[PDB]
Amino acid sequence: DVNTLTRFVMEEGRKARGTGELTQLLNSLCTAVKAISSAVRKAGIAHLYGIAGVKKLDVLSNDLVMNMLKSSFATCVLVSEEDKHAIIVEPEKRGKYVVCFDPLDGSSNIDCLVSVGTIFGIYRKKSTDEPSEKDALQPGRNLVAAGYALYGSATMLVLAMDCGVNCFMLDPAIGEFILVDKDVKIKKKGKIYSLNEGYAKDFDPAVTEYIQRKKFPPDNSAPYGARYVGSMVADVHRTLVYGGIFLYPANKKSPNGKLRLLYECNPMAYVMEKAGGMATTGKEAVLDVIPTDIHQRAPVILGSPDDVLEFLKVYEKHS
Amino acid sequence: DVNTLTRFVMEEGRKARGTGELTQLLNSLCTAVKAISSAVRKAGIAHLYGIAGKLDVLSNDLVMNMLKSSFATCVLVSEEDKHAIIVEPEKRGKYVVCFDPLDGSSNIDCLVSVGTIFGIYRKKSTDEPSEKDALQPGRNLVAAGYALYGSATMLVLAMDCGVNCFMLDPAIGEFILVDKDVKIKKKGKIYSLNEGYAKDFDPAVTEYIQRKKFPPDNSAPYGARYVGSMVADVHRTLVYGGIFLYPANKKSPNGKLRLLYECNPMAYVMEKAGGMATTGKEAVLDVIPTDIHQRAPVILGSPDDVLEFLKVYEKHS
Amino acid sequence: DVNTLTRFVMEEGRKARGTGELTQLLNSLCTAVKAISSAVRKAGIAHLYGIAGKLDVLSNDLVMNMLKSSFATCVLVSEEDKHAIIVEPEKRGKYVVCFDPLDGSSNIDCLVSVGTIFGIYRKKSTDEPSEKDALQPGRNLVAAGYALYGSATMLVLAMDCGVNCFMLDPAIGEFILVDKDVKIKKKGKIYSLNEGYAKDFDPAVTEYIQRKKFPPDNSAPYGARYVGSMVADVHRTLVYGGIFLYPANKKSPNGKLRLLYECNPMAYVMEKAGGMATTGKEAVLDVIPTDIHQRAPVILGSPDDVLEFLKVYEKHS
Amino acid sequence: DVNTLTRFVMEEGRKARGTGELTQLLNSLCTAVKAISSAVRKAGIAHLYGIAGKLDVLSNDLVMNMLKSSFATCVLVSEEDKHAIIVEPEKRGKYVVCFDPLDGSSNIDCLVSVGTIFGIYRKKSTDEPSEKDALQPGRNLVAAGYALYGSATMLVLAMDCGVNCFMLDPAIGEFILVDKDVKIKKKGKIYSLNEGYAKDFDPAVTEYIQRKKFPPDNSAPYGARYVGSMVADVHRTLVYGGIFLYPANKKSPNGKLRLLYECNPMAYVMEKAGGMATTGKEAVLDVIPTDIHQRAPVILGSPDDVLEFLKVYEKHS
Numbered sequence A: 001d002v003n004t005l006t007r008f009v010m011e012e013g014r015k016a017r018g019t020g021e022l023t024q025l026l027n028s029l030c031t032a033v034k035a036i037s038s039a040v041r042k043a044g045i046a047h048l049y050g051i052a053g054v055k056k057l058d059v060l061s062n063d064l065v066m067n068m069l070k071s072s073f074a075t076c077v078l079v080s081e082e083d084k085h086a087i088i089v090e091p092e093k094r095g096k097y098v099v100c101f102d103p104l105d106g107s108s109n110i111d112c113l114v115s116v117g118t119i120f121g122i123y124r125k126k127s128t129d130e131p132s133e134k135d136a137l138q139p140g141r142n143l144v145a146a147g148y149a150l151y152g153s154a155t156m157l158v159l160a161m162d163c164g165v166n167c168f169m170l171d172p173a174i175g176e177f178i179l180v181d182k183d184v185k186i187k188k189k190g191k192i193y194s195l196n197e198g199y200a201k202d203f204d205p206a207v208t209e210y211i212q213r214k215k216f217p218p219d220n221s222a223p224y225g226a227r228y229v230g231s232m233v234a235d236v237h238r239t240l241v242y243g244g245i246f247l248y249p250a251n252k253k254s255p256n257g258k259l260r261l262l263y264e265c266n267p268m269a270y271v272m273e274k275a276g277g278m279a280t281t282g283k284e285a286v287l288d289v290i291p292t293d294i295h296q297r298a299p300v301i302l303g304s305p306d307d308v309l310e311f312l313k314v315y316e317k318h319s
Numbered sequence B, C, D: 001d002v003n004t005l006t007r008f009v010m011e012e013g014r015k016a017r018g019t020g021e022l023t024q025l026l027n028s029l030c031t032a033v034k035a036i037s038s039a040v041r042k043a044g045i046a047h048l049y050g051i052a053g054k055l056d057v058l059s060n061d062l063v064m065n066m067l068k069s070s071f072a073t074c075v076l077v078s079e080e081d082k083h084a085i086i087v088e089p090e091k092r093g094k095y096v097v098c099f100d101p102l103d104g105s106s107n108i109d110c111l112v113s114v115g116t117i118f119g120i121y122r123k124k125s126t127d128e129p130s131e132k133d134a135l136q137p138g139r140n141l142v143a144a145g146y147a148l149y150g151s152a153t154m155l156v157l158a159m160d161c162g163v164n165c166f167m168l169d170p171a172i173g174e175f176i177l178v179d180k181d182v183k184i185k186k187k188g189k190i191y192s193l194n195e196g197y198a199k200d201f202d203p204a205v206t207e208y209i210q211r212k213k214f215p216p217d218n219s220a221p222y223g224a225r226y227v228g229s230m231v232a233d234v235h236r237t238l239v240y241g242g243i244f245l246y247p248a249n250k251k252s253p254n255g256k257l258r259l260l261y262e263c264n265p266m267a268y269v270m271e272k273a274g275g276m277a278t279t280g281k282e283a284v285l286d287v288i289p290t291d292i293h294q295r296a297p298v299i300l301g302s303p304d305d306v307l308e309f310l311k312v313y314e315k316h317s
């Protein structure tokens, strides 16, 4: 039987006999993802170029997500990569959910038409205070749901909840997300590692050794492949689909890494673990970090559990 | 003034006072690319999944059929077909086309960028057309380019008049001219190759890559990018500058990429954009192929970066 | 604040604190409409014509499969199916749906407007589900409406809360609420019927139309419009006011339009929009059907115009 | 073999060994039609309704701008513009175009069909371009046609080689040839006009229409259809046969429809398909216009039916 995102989420929401607020939010997010996809694919660009005789894509992506989440009545604190402060939903539109999102991740590299994406994490508001920015400072362990949209050769939405990970393919002819991969699980061990090796000069010594182990294996077995798109959603999704390891690790020049904990690292870690994978900073599980700043950075190394462990053994070797 | 791919090609063709045969070819290819783009973005996927109760084969069928029926071609070489296709007599025109209809399609399960690559030659003689007609060096290219099915769909067309970039507007099914007469940066800050094969590197590649990470003049190291789809990597090299390497090694002394419909059309685009493309030993466009599926090592991109690679290569003789 | 069909139905469903089964039904129906609209606009037609080397049956299969798989229905009546369809036990829900999946599709070769019409009943009896379940009078409707595949695709949904109009934005595949709680004009200036049957008209219809061309009060005559596709004619009537008539004639002594899936859903939308719908003898919504494909004469539209016709009807006993 | 409008026009242009200027025009027109179609189907409407926080004017702009930038035109006459538009010298070409960019847009609120009508003349003299270049009789048309934005979008193109119909595939933005060299039925079964204004009918129309409803023999009366949008009614007349009338009366002795960009292009299409088009006194294509916006009565369609109307018309003269 064919399944769409909206049918799937209404079905699970009825099994769980919830109020519907989470379902309303995901549906609002889904509309936003389709609007972003259409704009990323440059629909209507002919009008920018005078066919009949105007806002940047990440600004528009941010406006779309913000506006669709606010008007769902299901949220109260919204944190975006684009906004310094948490947005507090106005009283008449407030619901019980906190959302952290990157509206168009990888948009620095969009001039070359590389893959871009939207990342999101959804927390229940855990306190009875008046809603504030503090409500977004929960660890990834507390996520009710997370996922990402990938605007690649086709548009795919990956949704992770406590019942597992499911992949939906956008059918642009009818504007519906069709469930194509049910209950997804990552390979125990992959054959690809992914990181920016152009910065090897600054590598932590463990990262240098681990990558040396991938290119020059001690038992003279076959080397791993290298891939690095430079867009997290693209790189993380390839890890999920083919197995392997993705690294944006810490170094002495960037002791906490570069990616953001709330709206990049935590949702990707959540998808990974729900698929049977691992995600570490090296010192701790990504999801166990209690953030003190909504825009704080976190190092991340994720992928197949065996590949992340081998990096950890090398990491332990260098203390 | 707004410009479309079709309008642009008819204007240049009228300037040259040609017969229209190349214009008819390019328009058919333009149509094929739009069909491939629609399928690649998964239009109609709901019907595959039972809403009412392969992709590179379809891409090849799309390109094959639009070219055959364009009446401008006589020999078609595709990555998908071991032998050249000889167009049937009523449909023959004077052009040879070499193409990869969906380059990068092994890794489309992760939705990575894919693309179509093409190079167009003229028929080599008035005899009955044969596969030999596709064995010309890249220097003979009349036109070449690629479509990139990325976050958006873009067509890059390289002709003697230069390189122009068209963005597919999906709302109207038209290629809008967005980058006229495009030129690559003289020097970039990005290198692109699969470093997982570092065990097999030629010493010049080992040395050249070492200089990118540990610059002798204390400048900032290059960033690394490798999508693993040539069209994506080459297009990024064109747009941002840098260098793309798929070089020869001890296990593949002639490389991995195919010369006719991957290396040569990209080499032509690169040179037409002010960049360079070498095998290390010679310019790619100067290699005379003997087999339609022969491989070639390739190092392409910004001229200062390719020249710098060639100095290291000559250092190791 | 922007509103979509899915968002609207969920907001209304949670106000009512229902289980969601109706919302699941409507969402499945909306998806079928989007896919039907894509087929009507001929997306993918190029592949039928060999770019790589029936519409009402497809429309029926889309509505059938989406309703069956919604788990919300138990009896399905379609213009395309001789018998009611009984949903298999594991997929049964509490609703009966009667629909014309592609109304006007005989006259579609001229690209006339086409549409989907639907009416939704709660199953009223506790017997094992059967054809009898769809034989309820229109008064019992839970929801009804239509999709018009015209110059744009619009979905009209009438419920107890009134009539709402959603515009399909094809760029994102979403139904946008554009007309909230719509009410028809009290009196219009257009009449709509096939005047080619003037030879078979009953005296009251003959007289009513004569009054439209020759008003006794020297006011302006009404304009006439007749597309020949019920969704198009009724929707213009809803949007601009006026009157639509398909009375009985010698080829159709019980009228021509179908009671279950044409007259009742339109009568429901009209009355929820402040309009009227009569057979001449009784309200359409008060007709108790005995046969699922049975016909009814229909006169509907703005209330002043329908009353004016009814006054003429009583004049002739 | 699959055929597109662009491919078709290039093949026809090479048979005739023309310069390409007309082909550049039609291709520019085809692009404008696709953009118009996208807007009529309401793509991006979500943004108007605040998802992130003009239609006949846009149609006129799209056609004006695509014609100007084709380098194929010198005088442009539009229903939207009081005066003929003179293309600037540097963009001048040899053709005069008269068009209605969005005919029927008065009733577009009911989502009824709308359309673009166009007629293409060669400039006949070397004088400075002025309105006079647009005052040719329809006999001089080089090409004419219309786009119907209906249940699907179809482009009808009439030239000396006949009438051909192209279906827009929206998935790829391509007009697919679906009906080659079409001819209207010798006689139809449909009459089309606004019978609401029968009070003001010319007595000859009164008798003609009365004969369609009450045949003197035992044949079947005609059915009536009147969409109220000329492209829709005319296109149905083309596909199914019959007669479309927008005739003169004492209140409108020259009719209502405009001669240059409504009556003439349809007359040309009709005659190229084996149909007829008269004002009652003469063929529409024989009128020598004196004003770019002058009106002309039109009765067009199957030849047996127009001849029969002309018989009744002379009876009252």
Ligand SMILES: O=C(Nc1ncc(Br)s1)NS(=O)(=O)c1ccc(Cl)c(Cl)c1
Pocket (backbone or CB within 6 Å): A008, A009, A010, A011, A012, A013, A014, A016, A017, A018, A019, A020, A021, A022, A023, A024, A161, A163, C019, C020, C021, C023, C024
């Ligand atoms: O949506 C609902 N209930 C509903 N009742 C009727 C309809 Br129709 S939907 N509850 S929910 O709390 O939003 C929820 C709970 C679990 C999951 Cl897994 C998801 Cl996705 C959503």
Ligand SMILES: O=C(Nc1ncc(Br)s1)NS(=O)(=O)c1ccc(Cl)c(Cl)c1
Pocket (backbone or CB within 6 Å): B009, B010, B011, B012, B013, B014, B016, B017, B018, B019, B020, B021, B022, B023, B024, B026, B159, B161, D019, D020, D021, D023, D024
């Ligand atoms: O197309 C033409 N002639 C034409 N005449 C009228 C029209 Br309309 S097009 N010639 S051609 O050989 O195909 C050619 C030549 C140069 C370039 Cl640059 C390109 Cl693209 C194509």
Ligand SMILES: O=C(Nc1ncc(Br)s1)NS(=O)(=O)c1ccc(Cl)c(Cl)c1
Pocket (backbone or CB within 6 Å): A019, A020, A021, A023, A024, C009, C010, C012, C013, C014, C016, C017, C018, C019, C020, C021, C022, C023, C024, C159
């Ligand atoms: O849908 C629901 N409940 C829901 N709970 C959570 C969500 Br999310 S929806 N109930 S219903 O019976 O289907 C109904 C009732 C009234 C109307 Cl007006 C409509 Cl449309 C539908």
Ligand SMILES: O=C(Nc1ncc(Br)s1)NS(=O)(=O)c1ccc(Cl)c(Cl)c1
Pocket (backbone or CB within 6 Å): B019, B020, B021, B023, B024, D008, D009, D010, D011, D012, D013, D014, D016, D017, D018, D019, D020, D021, D022, D023, D024, D159
């Ligand atoms: O287009 C051309 N020539 C061309 N040369 C190369 C190409 Br490619 S097209 N000539 S034309 O005057 O525009 C013309 C003539 C007859 C028809 Cl029937 C049409 Cl459509 C158009």
